[PDB]
Enzyme design. Structure first.
Site, PDB file in Angstrom:
ATOM      1  N   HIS A 160      47.444  17.346  18.186  1.00  0.00           N
ATOM      2  CA  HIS A 160      46.056  16.590  17.536  1.00  0.00           C
ATOM      3  C   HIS A 160      46.438  16.551  15.958  1.00  0.00           C
ATOM      4  CE1 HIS A 160      43.863  17.892  21.206  1.00  0.00           C
ATOM      5  NE2 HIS A 160      44.666  17.004  21.485  1.00  0.00           N
ATOM      6  N   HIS A 216      42.815   9.324  24.439  1.00  0.00           N
ATOM      7  CA  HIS A 216      43.177  10.567  24.096  1.00  0.00           C
ATOM      8  C   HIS A 216      44.775  10.781  24.594  1.00  0.00           C
ATOM      9  CE1 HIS A 216      42.527  14.401  22.597  1.00  0.00           C
ATOM     10  NE2 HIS A 216      43.143  15.067  23.742  1.00  0.00           N
ATOM     11  N   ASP A 230      47.530  11.852  22.086  1.00  0.00           N
ATOM     12  CA  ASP A 230      48.484  12.638  22.281  1.00  0.00           C
ATOM     13  C   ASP A 230      49.969  12.059  21.921  1.00  0.00           C
ATOM     14  OD1 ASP A 230      46.690  14.706  22.963  1.00  0.00           O
ATOM     15  OD2 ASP A 230      47.130  14.630  25.009  1.00  0.00           O
ATOM     16  N   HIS A 237      53.130  16.130  28.145  1.00  0.00           N
ATOM     17  CA  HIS A 237      53.431  16.659  26.802  1.00  0.00           C
ATOM     18  C   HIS A 237      55.271  16.985  26.938  1.00  0.00           C
ATOM     19  CE1 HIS A 237      49.541  17.598  25.469  1.00  0.00           C
ATOM     20  NE2 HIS A 237      49.217  17.922  26.752  1.00  0.00           N
TER      21      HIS A 237
HETATM   22 CL1  LIG Z   1      37.735  22.820  28.770  1.00  0.00          CL
HETATM   23  C1  LIG Z   1      39.316  22.492  28.900  1.00  0.00           C
HETATM   24  C2  LIG Z   1      39.664  21.058  29.342  1.00  0.00           C
HETATM   25  C3  LIG Z   1      40.845  20.643  29.343  1.00  0.00           C
HETATM   26  C4  LIG Z   1      41.855  21.367  28.738  1.00  0.00           C
HETATM   27  C5  LIG Z   1      43.180  20.939  29.000  1.00  0.00           C
HETATM   28  C6  LIG Z   1      43.897  20.661  27.794  1.00  0.00           C
HETATM   29  C7  LIG Z   1      44.659  19.332  27.623  1.00  0.00           C
HETATM   30  N1  LIG Z   1      45.228  19.102  26.563  1.00  0.00           N
HETATM   31  C8  LIG Z   1      45.224  19.858  25.201  1.00  0.00           C
HETATM   32  C9  LIG Z   1      45.449  19.218  24.251  1.00  0.00           C
HETATM   33  N2  LIG Z   1      45.546  17.929  24.536  1.00  0.00           N
HETATM   34  C10 LIG Z   1      45.348  17.923  25.771  1.00  0.00           C
HETATM   35  C11 LIG Z   1      41.636  22.651  28.486  1.00  0.00           C
HETATM   36  C12 LIG Z   1      40.455  23.139  28.368  1.00  0.00           C
HETATM   37 ZN   LIG Z   2      45.044  16.325  23.462  1.00  0.00          ZN
END
Ligand SMILES: Clc1ccc(CCCn2ccnc2)cc1
Ligand SMILES: [Zn+2]
Length: 286
Positions: free
Chosen positions: A78, A237, A241, A264
């Site tokens: 991010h 999102h 990413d 990822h």
């Molecule tokens: Cl509450 C919660 C919700 C979703 C995830 C998955 C995160 C996936 N992610 C991380 C960064 N970008 C996407 C973790 C905790």
């Molecule tokens: Zn993310």
């Protein structure tokens, strides 16, 4: 010529690691020409420095993780989406612990923080990696591809089964000549279905996560009282990413990306496959 960019002043911020749960201190400083973005663990003796480059990616399981020997920097996508989005070539990122703070789950807080530094135009021509040929990688139904383009254009598609997507394409394009990163992308938050989240919390992951720093979804609906920031926040999102994962090339991109159900891991395979295929890219200035 178009010139390189760093920050004018030091900046601090604070927060919790999405996976780790730990309180963490973040500092951003200015950097000389040709430094790139560099993460530094300042809590260790000796201090560990890790460039934000595809070569340092250790794990890719539901975050992007920088590794060097035995030492981690977790969830960098991010912040790099932000550093990509404001054309920051050069910057040091010090951390008090192993995970970048989640904040509100978007690039919003990082984008404002960087603007609060100010922008330093440095005495050195900016470098871009330009795509010359098609490159793609597939894995089952998943697909990621770089195509040549005189601009920078990102597209994405997801394929979930849920009431929330009823009636919807799950599809978004953004051409950054004609739209704003900060306005149309930076605010989209991290999302998670209850089942996925519970499976992480059983494996000692997702520990800082809740409705304050992410969108949560049950069998029926979004649990967040105040609701969504865009009608297509989830796929938006995935684009944010992708933009962070691409900035691991170490430079800004002249070309077009398209994702189909990728994350990822597949995003990182595409970098390595492109980098390896020398005839498909070239570094260029103006
Ligand atoms: Cl509450 C919660 C919700 C979703 C995830 C998955 C995160 C996936 N992610 C991380 C960064 N970008 C996407 C973790 C905790
Ligand atoms: Zn993310």
């Amino acid at each position: 010529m178009i010139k390189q960019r760093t920050l004018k002043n030091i900046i601090r911020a604070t927060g919790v690691g999405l996976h780790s749960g730990e309180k963490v201190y973040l500092t951003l400083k200015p950097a000389p020409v040709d430094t790139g973005i560099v993460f530094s663990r300042t809590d260790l003796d000796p201090v560990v420095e890790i460039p934000a480059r595809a070569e340092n990616v250790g794990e890719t399981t539901m975050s992007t993780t920088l590794v060097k020997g035995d030492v981690k920097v977790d969830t960098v996508e991010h912040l790099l989406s932000a550093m990509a989005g404001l054309g920051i070539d050069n910057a040091y990122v010090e951390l008090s612990a192993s995970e970048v703070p989640i904040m509100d789950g978007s690039a919003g807080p990082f984008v404002f923080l960087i603007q609060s530094a100010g922008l330093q135009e440095q005495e050195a021509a900016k470098k871009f990696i330009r795509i010359k040929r098609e490159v793609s990688v597939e894995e089952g139904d998943k697909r990621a591809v770089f195509v040549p383009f005189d601009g920078f254009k990102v597209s994405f598609e997801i394929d979930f089964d849920h009431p929330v997507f009823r009636g919807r394409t799950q599809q978004a394009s953004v051409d950054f000549s004609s739209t704003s990163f900060v306005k149309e992308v930076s605010r989209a938050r991290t999302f998670g279905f209850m089942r996925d989240i519970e499976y992480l919390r059983s494996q000692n992951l997702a520990l800082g996560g809740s409705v304050e720093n992410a969108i949560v979804v049950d069998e029926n609906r979004v649990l967040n009282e105040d609701g969504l920031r865009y009608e297509d926040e989830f796929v938006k999102h995935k684009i944010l990413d992708a933009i962070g994962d691409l900035y691991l090339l170490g430079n800004s991109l002249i070309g077009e990306f398209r994702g189909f159900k990728s994350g990822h891991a597949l995003n990182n395979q595409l970098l390595r496959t492109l980098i390896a295929d020398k005839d498909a890219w070239e570094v260029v200035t103006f």
